[PDB]
A paper describes a structure:
Aspartate/asparagine-β-hydroxylase (AspH) is a human 2OG oxygenase catalyzing post-translational hydroxylation of Asp/Asn-residues in epidermal growth factor-like domains (EGFDs) in the endoplasmic reticulum. The human 2OG oxygenase aspartate/asparagine-β-hydroxylase (AspH, BAH, HAAH)13 is highly unusual amongst human 2OG dependent hydroxylases, because its Fe(ii) cofactor is complexed by only two residues (His679 and His725) rather than by the typical triad of ligands (HXD/E⋯H) found in other human 2OG oxygenases. AspH is of significant interest from a cancer research perspective, because its levels are upregulated in invasive cancers (e.g. hepatocellular carcinoma and pancreatic cancer) and it is translocated to the cell surface where it can be used as a diagnostic and prognostic marker. Thus, the combined crystallographic analyses reveal that the C3/C4-substituted 2OG derivatives bind AspH in the same general manner as 2OG, with near identical binding modes for the oxalyl-groups and the C5-carboxylates.
In the reported AspH crystal structures, the natural AspH cosubstrate 2OG was substituted for a 2OG competing inhibitor (e.g. NOG, 2,4-PDCA or l-malate),22,41a but an AspH crystal structure complexed with 2OG has not previously been reported. To enable comparisons of how 2OG and the 2OG derivatives bind AspH, AspH was first crystallized in the presence of 2OG with the natural AspH cofactor Fe(ii) being replaced by Mn(ii). Clear electron density corresponding to 2OG was observed; the C5-carboxylate of 2OG being positioned to form a salt bridge with the side chain of Arg735 (2.4 and 3.0 Å) and to interact with Ser668 (2.6 Å), which is part of an ‘RXS motif’ present in some other 2OG oxygenases. The C1-carboxylate of 2OG is positioned to interact with Arg688 (2.7 and 2.9 Å) and His690 (3.3 Å). The C1-carboxylate of 2OG and the 2OG C2-carbonyl group complex the Mn ion in a bidentate manner (1.6 and 2.5 Å). Two water molecules also coordinate the Mn ion (2.1 and 2.4 Å) along with the two anticipated residues His679 and His725 (2.2 and 2.1 Å). Thus, the AspH:2OG structure supports the proposal (based on the AspH structures in complex with the 2OG analogue NOG22) that the active site metal, when bound to the natural AspH cosubstrate 2OG, is complexed by only two AspH residues rather than by the typical triad of ligands (HXD/E⋯H) found in other human 2OG hydroxylases. Superimposition of the AspH:2OG structure with the reported AspH:NOG22 and AspH:l-malate22 structures reveals that AspH adopts similar conformations in all structures and that 2OG binds the AspH active site in a similar manner to NOG (Cα RMSD = 0.21 and 0.21 Å, ESI Fig. S7†).
Numbering used by the authors: 331 to 757
């Protein structure tokens, strides 16, 4: 790196020393070092970069946002100093942009990336990063405009390609997006080996019915992005038994299964009564996972918090679940009624965590046409009986019956999580 300017050049013995007290883990000595040099050598750009770098790490150690803000201003100050090395300038502002992104000053970071591109119009790597600035604030139109400029000069930049495909996919151009995602990943370009882009590729493919997408999930696994080709949840705890379908006995939560099966008509009636007397408390489910049809849910507990307004509506049922904190205390689950109507298709998808099991109590199940697949096994519900699967495995759902299907969904902690784990995990 061209990081010693003439202005700064002639202090290297002193400059280098500050670098040693930092590199030795004595940033406190090191921070205070450079500061004097700012006093002593005020215009040195390298004297001001190091300052920022000291307090940047000083912020890492103290884990302090406020301190880090200090460093962000100081990285900037480098850029004001006159007669600065280009290599050094780039370094300080790139880091500023990133530390700003870290703290969530997304538009502030975008503003810095805008500068960096004015100052290095032939650095396509910075144009790439600018595109990310735009995505991070929601301006996909300008992000699209950026990757098109890159790709017009750099036809084969895979970073630009995978982001370009993301963007297309996000504008509902699913099929156009797939070759971009494939080519950008295949390039192995830096930044393309990202779990996010296998996810969107395989999704897109699944949504255009191309079978080749499991190949890509399987690769994401062998790259470490997915627990397996089927188990693709993000927030995971290692060493939890991973199987798609479970039985009551296998989970140990047999008392819960029994309360549910045995009082099932009561659970049904209180949901059926909400459909009648307050249809509005069923909200539509994920429009993103709903290919077509009518699919709605009525939540009682979300992430171990009882919706108090909802237990007024189905009171005995809430009373029943109070006896079972493996579910009501599942900070990584919900407890909800779910109604699917004819002509509904739920795209393949997985849940966010392997730290819960999903139980489904059948309440109103048409005698034909409702099925659910989890990994390679497809099954159907029975009124009054309970299914259990690990919704961190890809699952998919169809409603091709002639009347409505109502179920009751009940998340439990994954049975192998210990008490201290259940207490400590964030939701
Ligand atoms: O309501 C349903 O049948 C869909 C369930 C589902 O996709 C899920 O439980 O994660």
């Amino acid at each position: 790196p061209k990081l010693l300017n003439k202005f700064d050049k002639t202090i290297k013995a002193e400059l280098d020393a500050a670098e040693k007290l930092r590199k030795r883990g004595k940033i406190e000595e090191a921070v205070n070092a450079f500061k004097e040099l700012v006093r002593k050598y005020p215009q040195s750009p390298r004297a001001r970069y190091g300052k920022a770098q000291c307090e940047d790490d000083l912020a890492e150690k103290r884990r302090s946002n406020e301190v880090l803000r200090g460093a962000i201003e100081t990285y900037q100050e480098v850029a004001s100093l006159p007669d600065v090395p280009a290599d050094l300038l780039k370094l300080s502002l790139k880091r500023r942009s990133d530390r700003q992104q870290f703290l969530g000053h997304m538009r502030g970071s975008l503003l810095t990336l805008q500068r960096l591109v004015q100052l290095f119009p032939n650095d396509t790597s910075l144009k790439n990063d600018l595109g990310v600035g735009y995505l991070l604030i929601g301006d996909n139109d300008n992000a699209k405009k950026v990757y098109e400029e890159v790709l017009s000069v750099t036809p084969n930049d895979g970073f630009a390609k995978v982001h370009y495909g993301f963007i297309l996919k996000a504008q509902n151009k699913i099929a156009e997006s797939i070759p971009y995602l494939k080519e950008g990943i295949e390039s192995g370009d830096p930044g393309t080996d990202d779990g996010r882009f296998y996810f969107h590729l395989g999704d897109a493919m699944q949504r255009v019915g191309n079978k080749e997408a499991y190949k890509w999930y399987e690769l994401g696994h062998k790259r470490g992005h997915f627990a397996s080709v089927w188990q693709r949840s993000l927030y995971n705890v290692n060493g939890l038994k991973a199987q798609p379908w479970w039985t009551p006995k296998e989970t140990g939560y047999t008392e819960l299964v029994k309360s549910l099966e045995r009082n099932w008509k009561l659970i049904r009636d209180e949901g059926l009564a909400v459909m009648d007397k307050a249809k509005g408390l069923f909200l539509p489910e994920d429009e993103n996972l709903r290919e077509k049809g009518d699919w709605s849910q009525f939540t009682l507990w979300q992430q171990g918090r009882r919706n108090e307004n909802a237990c007024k509506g189905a009171p005995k049922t809430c009373t029943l679940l109070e006896k079972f904190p493996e579910t009501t205390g599942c900070r990584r689950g919900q407890i909800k009624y779910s109604i699917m109507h004819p002509g509904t298709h739920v795209w393949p998808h997985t849940g966010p965590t392997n730290c819960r099991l999903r139980m489904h109590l059948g309440l109103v199940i048409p005698k034909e046409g409702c099925k659910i697949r989890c990994a390679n096994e497809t099954k159907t519900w029975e009124e009054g009986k309970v299914l259990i699967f690990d919704d961190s495995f890809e699952h998919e759902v169809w409603q091709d019956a002639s009347s409505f299907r109502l179920i009751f969904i009940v998340d439990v902690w994954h049975p192998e999580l210990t008490p201290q784990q259940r207490r400590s995990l964030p939701a």
